[PDB]
A paper describes a structure:
ABCA4 (also known as ABCR or the rim protein) is a retinal-specific member of the ABCA subfamily predominantly expressed in the outer segment disk membranes of photoreceptor cells, and was the first ABCA transporter that has been linked to genetic disease. Available evidence suggested that ABCA4 may act as a flippase to translocate N-retinylidene-phosphatidylethanolamine (NRPE), a reversible covalent adduct of all-trans retinal (ATR) and phosphatidylethanolamine (PE), from the luminal leaflet to the cytoplasmic leaflet of the disk membrane. Here, we show the molecular structures of human ABCA4 determined in three distinct functional states by single-particle cryo-EM to 3.3–3.4 Å. These structures delineate the conformational transitions of ABCA4 to flip NRPE and suggest a “lateral access and extrusion” mechanism for ABCA4-mediated NRPE recognition and translocation, a mechanism that might also be adopted by other ABCA transporters.
To visualize ATP-driven conformational rearrangements of ABCA4, we characterized the structure of ABCA4QQ, a mutation that abolished ATP hydrolysis but maintained ATP binding, in the presence of 10 mM ATP/Mg2+. The structure was resolved at an overall resolution of 3.3 Å, showing excellent side-chain density for most of the protein except the lid and RD regions. Two strong and well-defined EM densities were observed for two bound ATP-Mg2+ molecules that were sandwiched between the two NBDs. The two NBDs exhibit a typical “head-to-tail” configuration predicted for all ABC transporters, forming two ATP binding-sites between the Walker A motif of one NBD and the ABC signature motif of the other NBD. The V-shaped lateral-opening conformation of the TMDs in the nucleotide-free ABCA4 structures is completely altered upon NBD dimerization induced by ATP binding. The two TMDs in the ATP-bound state form a closed conformation owing to the extensive interactions between TMs 1/2/5 and TMs 7/8/11, in contrast to a narrow interface in the cytoplasmic membrane leaflet between TM5 and TM11 in the nucleotide-free state. In the ATP-bound state, the NRPE and phospholipid-binding cavities in both membrane leaflets have been completely collapsed, with no space for bound molecules. The S-loop, which participates in NRPE substrate recognition in the nucleotide-free state, was not resolved in the ATP-bound state, suggesting the intrinsic flexibility of the S-loop during the transport cycle. After ATP binding, the ECD exhibits an obvious rotation toward the membrane, with a displacement for ~20 Å observed at the far end of the tunnel region. Our study also suggests that ATP binding might be sufficient for the NRPE-extrusion step and that ATP hydrolysis might be required to reset the transporter to the lateral-opening conformation ready for the next transport cycle.
Author numbering: 1 to 163, 209 to 218, 231 to 239, 243 to 334, 361 to 455, 460 to 471, 476 to 491, 499 to 878, ...
Amino acid sequence: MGFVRQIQLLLWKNWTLRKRQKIRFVVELVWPLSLFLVLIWLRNANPLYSHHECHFPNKAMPSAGMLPWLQGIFCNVNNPCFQSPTPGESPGIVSNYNNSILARVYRDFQELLMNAPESQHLGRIWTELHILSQFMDTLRTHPERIAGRGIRIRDILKDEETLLLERFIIFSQSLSQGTLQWTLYANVDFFKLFRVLPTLLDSRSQGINLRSWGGILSDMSPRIQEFIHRPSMQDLLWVTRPLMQNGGPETFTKLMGILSDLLCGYPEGGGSRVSYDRRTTSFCNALIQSLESNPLTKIAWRAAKPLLMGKILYTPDSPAARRILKNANSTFEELEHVRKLVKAWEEVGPQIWYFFDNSTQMNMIRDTLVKDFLNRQLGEEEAILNFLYKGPRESQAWRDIFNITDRTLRLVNQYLECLVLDKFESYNDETQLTQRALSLLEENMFWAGVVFPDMYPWTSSLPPHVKYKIRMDIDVVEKTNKIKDRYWDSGPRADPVEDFRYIWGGFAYLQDMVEQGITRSQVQAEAPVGIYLQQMPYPCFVDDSFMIILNRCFPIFMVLAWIYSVSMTVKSIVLEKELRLKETLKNQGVSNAVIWCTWFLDSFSIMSMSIFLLTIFIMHGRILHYSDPFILFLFLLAFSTATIMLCFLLSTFFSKASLAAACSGVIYFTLYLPHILCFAWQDRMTAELKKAVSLLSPVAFGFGTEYLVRFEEQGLGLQWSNIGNSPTEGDEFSFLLSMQMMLLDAAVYGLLAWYLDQVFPGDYGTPLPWYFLLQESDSFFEREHPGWVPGVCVKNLVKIFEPCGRPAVDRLNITFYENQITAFLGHNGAGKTTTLSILTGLLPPTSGTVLVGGRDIETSLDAVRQSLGMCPQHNILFHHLTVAEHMLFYAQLKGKSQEEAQLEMEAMLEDTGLHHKRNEEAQDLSGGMQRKLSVAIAFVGDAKVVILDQPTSGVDPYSRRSIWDLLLKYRSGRTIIMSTHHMDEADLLGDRIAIIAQGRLYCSGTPLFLKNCFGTGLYLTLVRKDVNELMDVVLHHVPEAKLVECIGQELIFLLPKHRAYASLFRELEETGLSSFGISDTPLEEIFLKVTEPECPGPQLNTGTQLVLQHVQALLVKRFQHTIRSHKDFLAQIVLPATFVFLALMLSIVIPPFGEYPALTLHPWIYGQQYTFFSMDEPGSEQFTVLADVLLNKPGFGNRCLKEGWLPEYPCGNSTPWKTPSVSPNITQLFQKQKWTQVNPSPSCRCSTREKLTMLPECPEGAGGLPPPQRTQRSTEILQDLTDRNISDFLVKTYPALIRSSLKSKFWVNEQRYGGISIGGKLPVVPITGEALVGFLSDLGRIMNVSGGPITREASKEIPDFLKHLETEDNIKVWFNNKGWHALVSFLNVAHNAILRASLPKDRSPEEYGITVISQPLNLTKEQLSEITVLTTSVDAVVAICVIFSMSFVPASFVLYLIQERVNKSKHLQFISGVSPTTYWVTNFLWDIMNYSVSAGLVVGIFIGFQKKAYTSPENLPALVALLLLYGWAVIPMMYPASFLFDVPSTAYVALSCANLFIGINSSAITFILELFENNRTLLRFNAVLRKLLIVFPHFCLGRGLIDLALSQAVTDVYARFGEEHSANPFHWDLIGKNLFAMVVEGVVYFLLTLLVQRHFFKTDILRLHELTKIYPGTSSPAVDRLCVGVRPGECFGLLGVNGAGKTTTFKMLTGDTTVTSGDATVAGKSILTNISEVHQNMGYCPQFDAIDELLTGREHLYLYARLRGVPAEEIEKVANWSIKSLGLTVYADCLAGTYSGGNKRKLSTAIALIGCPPLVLLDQPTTGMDPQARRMLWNVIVSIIREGRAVVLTSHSMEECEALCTRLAIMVKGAFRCMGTIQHLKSKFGDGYIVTMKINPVEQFFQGNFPGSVQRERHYNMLQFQVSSSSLARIFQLLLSEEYSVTQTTLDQVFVNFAKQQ
Ligand SMILES: Nc1ncnc2c1ncn2[C@@H]1O[C@H](COP(=O)(O)OP(=O)(O)OP(=O)(O)O)[C@@H](O)[C@H]1O
Ligand SMILES: *[C@@H]1O[C@H](CO)[C@@H](O)[C@H](O)[C@H]1NC(C)=O
Ligand SMILES: *[C@@H]1O[C@H](CO)[C@@H](O)[C@H](O)[C@H]1NC(C)=O
Ligand SMILES: *[C@@H]1O[C@H](CO)[C@@H](O)[C@H](O)[C@H]1NC(C)=O
Ligand SMILES: *[C@@H]1O[C@H](CO)[C@@H](O)[C@H](O)[C@H]1NC(C)=O
Ligand SMILES: [Mg+2]
Ligand SMILES: [Mg+2]
């Protein structure tokens, strides 16, 4: 139950302390919500994009004819989406190329010219022309009548008459004209005719057909003119305009567009697109080289070359293979027939030129014709526009149509000869084929390599099941080890380049050719069926653009937000431990488990609020949109628990906070590194190995975060229904396993932390054995009175400290009895605190035992601590609480009611003198009040043993009275142990006394026993203000000894005969010295008997030697500091480089590279699946059998042959056709409302703006009714889609099918991959074969060409040529591109069915088949796309790790600067004169050489791993200059921060985190924003940021480390193909600009730190005038207006009550704090204006030790001599004098941090006197010094006062302010109360004779003898008494009966009642 109360109190304290910060807390719970702001914005920069449907054009294969094959290659290069069903996916069409102008032209030509009433008589004209040219024109070699000649003759003959002429000649050139001319009317006029048509004049089989030739042209006149003006011809001529204009169009910009709309037609704009070579011609190698070396067409040529010019290598040399590949080269045969035809031109051309130059039928017929009749004949429907425009015979400027023909038709012949059309080479082994392929690959002249495995080189007969292989290289083939993607994306997979490697790589074409060869080799009656391929359409979907960066940034940004919390809690666990605040709590009796429970609750309650805020931002910021808030909350909660218990585990390794701040973040982030292995071993990990590694909590976090992201990139969330099932196929270890294996780690970490705490409590506390689970649960010394009881007992201790060697404590034997106070005295290095640290469990002994209640602490500390109280020598308080809160907290921890605690606190506040504060923080107290509170809270509660040492060192004589009252009130029932130095109280209130010397007792017992043990006598005191006089004056009554002590302004005499003594004092009274005082024997004389030069500085250096001495001094100081703390150096310098080393070592382990397997291609590589078919175009025989042999007899493919196929996929039976039943609502819906042909079914609603979905909803009216189904023997479901809209069915049914796949197996699946569709016709050119060649032959015979030798070969192959450009009857296959190997599988299905559908009717088609196999060529490679992404992914994280590492080193230099700024050790060096510039410059110079070691170590690692892009002969200087100049730039940026943090560890943590935040969120935003080149507003931001963000060195390093890595991948990919460009990474665009910004920054920030340093920094000396100091938070002044002056040779006093303003004055004088309204002058130089000038005329000794705890005592003196003049050859004797004079010989070199606490004061005053400054300021120079050392200090001060130097002291011991001081000044709250000499005070204040006795019976003893008395005190067996000035005290001394004592007046009693009265 008390457990719960203590929990509540601890939590109350923590939350009270947090109520004061309100900034360390807000930053604490806001820091993680800050790494996500970039993502929150960058999400809303990119709203989601919804994509329309896609419909794609089909692809003809080589077997579909050459013309559509090539046309499809050209038109469908980019594979465009069309959004509306293309014509090719209609039941009986394949064409898909209308709206092409070249096709509409044919449409109009068939519609108008031909098949009409104008083409009837045209052939008759041709036939009559041929008859003419055969009969009348050709009349030379044949016999005829006289009227005949090759040109012209006359038949004039048979003349019987004798032999006007012009008239007849004109007239002939008339039937009734010659009849009346008369003879010639009976012989030559018999059958004569006129000039009419003589076409009837010949002897011909037909009568005549003339007078119709010109009378048929008018019929077809309105047809041609109509045609030419049709819109199709307008478009043709419009687009052909920029072709013949001067020859040559623009290369690939508009030429492609013209050819596109000329051949292709695609609408809506063209779719969306989602060395001297040998055996060649000097043209063909010039062309290829000009094409390859043009950096614009190298890419397309790189892919097109192996098909145009590559070669195909086939393995065995057998007649079977030769036959197959003879039948497979049909395509190349019909491709070289074209070359033949075009080559025939080089022969026909000159013949046509001649015929149209000379002709008997043109140049002698048409040039000879006359024109009178022609003009009228033309006009009745131009000779000048015809017979001259096209019939010229001599040059005129007809050639316009002939000299473009050769230009355009010989260039084509030059082009076509570059093709290689013989490409089948024959080998005898796959090995030989492989080496020849290796040879050919470099030239890029390797197509595939075909292998027939089952046939031997003698094979002749084909088996009826042929299998072959196509072996290509991996860069043009899909991988054969996996068949799909790892995760189901939502897209069609339709990128023409990287998703269609089976098409542009040439695999599918060769497979088609060889399947057709195999079919044609064993059928002999093949069906001419061709094949088209069609891609199944895809619905509308939603694009992301975001989960490409989200999935690569989420599980870094999520694990990196907790690094600040981890560091701030591991550091806070360790501050309490090494600041000793855990041990005070454990001393007040707080259990050990309450500590841990409070830590856990207080950490959990703070992490749980940032968890909440983080979830709210993650969801409402739309980073995750589909998931569940509650599950995310619970996941983060489990992580919080794991991380907290990890922090508890880590805190038990460290003891110093600065060391834990430097390791916690690095270790937290190095436990996450094993997630590098997820890049290479992505698939070869197992759920069991995944469990084994998830014991490290961050990797379990990463495993869970990946599922969180992935369930969303698959369109779902983390709903409560799919935790336990992974998204990826066939892997265990779901999300729940990560969540559940976080809690196992929480438990394990916590349990181990609890155990490991007990065994290794470093540096404060007692360890346990590693097996503590065996469950234990004369004479010097006074005679011992057998009475009271013993309390604490000590028995033979030893404590050896390892370095020092000597025993600090050596065999003690003491007992402290119960009901009394003991005083525990000794010199300084005695063992008083080392012993009292052992009685309490602060540190373990080397030997011996102690016993508190008879129970030894070696086993029973828990019970001992239940009743303890303690105050330590140096204060430890919660520096932000209050006085009242301290006392109200410790009182209740012991267990008390709240109101009783109020009462006790109220009493003790007044009792201790700490009232009037009661509300001030424990840091605004002075240093005596802190020591006073530290005692007050040792008595509160109720202890039984109270151990309190040095309880009064620093408290003024007026408050020591209250402390004594407090001690004597609680002595009643406790054992109290006091350790003290000043002896006024060691005897007054000590019931016993013990003394230690060198770590063991020297004496013991009650004080009276000690006195007679050593000696006793009176002590005559003569306080002066000449020795010979006194000596002779005390010779008259010469006793024992004489002068025993004589220091400045003091004296001492010892004298053991009433008249003798009586006469002395009496006579002395009336007869140079001032007052005096006799006594019995002090307690300081017996303690004093137990234990038992450089006055000028000549020539202090100055100038450049002084500066060069300062630099050396500081560098040596820093070297000494860092040699002795090497764990800190290791953990701050070498650790980050080790982190980098681990990160690079991990990215080296990679799986070995095997080889790509076989993978027989068939549709059952996939699982259960649907297929379909569609028997379009029925009734045609030869298709009713092809639709029968792919359903019923063997079915699809080869999974059911007669013998067997692959005994891995067994058959079975089938089921009857069965149309499934549908719900009635559909039945009424589809018949009720009338639909149409273009709208068969209701449409699907997409993913609305506010209705986000992955795929549309598609209501219950999808593409129709369910079609008939069946289950085939292949264990597949094919559904018959005959006479239905397939494009509608597939599109509107894909979504509902994708949902029905994750109900059972939670991973989404694709259940449909393809199907056949029998039918499809395209119209073949109606022109037959032999008819064409006959027409050509007749035309040639008319036109006198006769051809030539080439033409007979060219025109020998026309009939077969025209049969191979079209097919007219063919099928088409549909495929789904999501499955990689789904194209070739179904292509094989189709070819195999075509084979079975055509073999004869007695061969049983169930045992014939073809199978294909892929098997890449053994080149030992990977695909480029794989290694590129792997390399960039790995080499990004290396840059991330280097940035993380170099972000921690720069903050490591602030630890020393902050550590020195507080404790006032930097100010104490400025006092010696170091001129801030040299200090800062030297620190910078040390930091640089400290940094360069880490930089060099990182570089050495990069060299060792041989990482390119970093260690290459062109990059290494760039890397070195990046690192070495980043450090220069960034180091002087931490320095201004050392001015506002007080705890070094806090600064370390808060600066490392800020550096990491900037260095991550500057070098990722500009690499993400540049990735998005789509958006235009992003480029503005990217450009402006890449310049604004240059002021941070973090950006300048983050850019460069990733640039040098990106700009080497782009060259190592070039090495794959082509040339190899170098880097030169120094350009003013890569890193050259950053390296310039570094240098400017590195010198602008240093000036900023030197500027911020400046905002913070008569015959007498030190004249003070009215000066004041009001502290900011109060109302009354700390130091009111005060004014003095000190002369050269005096010593000022500066006494004062506790809390009066004495250290504030010294702080203002030395220049620490800021004066308020005053002035002060040291040697003429004022302190307000020029203070660097006064600083060299004074020394300073602070109240608190300002020393470096790691050098030594001697190295301090050397440092502080060098920081002054004292040239290099004198420092040794100055140091030796200072060491010897102050008493530091035993331990002059022992690590000043191990001094005792009275030796630290000696060191401080020793280094306050180096040099010889005229003014010396000392502040409490003697608080922990024993009486032996105080005298040595007094002697030194007297020796320096005698020179002429001034001293100012501030002390609280009045034994010395009257021994060496000349002027005093009591100082109450503000200014002074009473200045003046010592005698000026005593005389006016206090008569004298303060008689003190020891012992009612003595109270009445001063009734008549001494009436005037006034009582001072009434204590225990000691009490004081003031008696009036009677001078008869020694007279009445014979009336006593005790401790004799009387004195004139001590200054101690004067100061008590001086301050009593105010
Ligand atoms: N940082 C501070 N803020 C507010 N008040 C302060 C601060 N430091 C000191 N004081 C107050 O100013 C007064 C002067 O304190 P100062 O340190 O001069 O006392 P002191 O005489 O040096 O004490 P002691 O004599 O024990 O050394 C004290 O009352 C103290 O409470
Ligand atoms: C040309 O294509 C159009 C486009 O739909 C089609 O309607 C027409 O039937 C086609 N003409 C043919 C193939 O002759
Ligand atoms: C036609 O081009 C040829 C070049 O092949 C040229 O010699 C001839 O002169 C051109 N025709 C005319 C009419 O000039
Ligand atoms: C190709 O590599 C595979 C890898 O195992 C090996 O089995 C096969 O024999 C090799 N064949 C050739 C022709 O290199
Ligand atoms: C559709 O028909 C079903 C019966 O199958 C009926 O329950 C429902 O009310 C009808 N209307 C709808 C679903 O809008
Ligand atoms: Mg001590
Ligand atoms: Mg002080």
